[PDB]
Amino acid sequence: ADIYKAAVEQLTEEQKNEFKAAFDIFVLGAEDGSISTKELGKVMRMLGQNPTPEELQEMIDEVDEDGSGTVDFDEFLVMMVRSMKDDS
Template identity: 45%
Template sequence: MVQGGKAEHRVSSIKKEFLLIDKNGDGKITAKELGAVLKQVGEDPNKKQLKDMIASVDTDGSGTLDFNEFVNLIIKQVKEQPQDNSLIINPDVLAAFKVYDKNGDGKVSKKEIKQVLKDMLGKGFSDEIALMAEDMIAVADTDGDGKNSPECWLGIHL
């Protein structure tokens, strides 16, 4: 796949995540929506931490995240990662990975990601979301085994 294709897949994956977090579909992620998804991955930020997180990238001062601000938040988190050659996985990303790795084998399969999304979304889970889950795995599946390791997981969330 050419580099441009990877970038397009990454943007598409981020857009899909944005749409999943934006529960009411208004094109904005509120502190409440952000907090709910962070709780799903084992984090429990308080209201001030959530507001600070949003404020750090909220260019229009709305108190919410539009898609571009959401991308900037992800970029900001990536930039805070060590830039040396060693792979140090952010504890938040590892916690998210463990939520999806239901059988604890160190890999996330399509079946596992679909189950977590089904649990999170309940009746909101659809065939379209199932396809998005498959896309999330395919985008970062560097070894072609149909599963993602924590290192591959970084590819989905960066």
């Protein structure tokens, strides 16, 4: 339980702040006060990444459990935690 959550807790103030901060900045007019695979994209490449529009939907579809493809202040710190071991 709480597999990625325990990881988002070991993050650094530079990561938690950049997340919520970049989120609100990218949530401006977002689909629903959040950043779904369609909004997180431009928000992910800015954190130091460059995935594709195809793996994006599948990425959340794996961590998400509602079938919405949205990532508010929660699935963002979780989906980014898996990318830490997906490239290592």
